[PDB]
């Protein structure tokens, strides 16, 4: 399966993008919680 082997970098990049978005959202959520505490 050459197709999946060629698309594996794309899948890895998409997973990296998703992890970046999820981490950013968790970071922003904690910042919002600190804002509400204030």
């Amino acid at each position: 399966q050459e197709l999946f082997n060629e698309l594996k970098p794309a899948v890895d990049g998409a997973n990296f993008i998703v992890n970046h978005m999820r981490d950013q959202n968790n970071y922003n959520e904690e910042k919002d919680s600190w804002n509400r505490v204030a």
């Binding site: 060629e6 698309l7 970098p9 794309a10 890895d12 990049g13 998409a14 990296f16 993008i17 970046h20």
Partner: peptide, 24 residues
Amino acid sequence: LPELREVVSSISYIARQLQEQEDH
């Protein structure tokens, strides 16, 4: 399959930019 190659290049560029932002 130029379309899939272009998609892979775009995704790799997006990941590279986000990694650069992470290091910064």
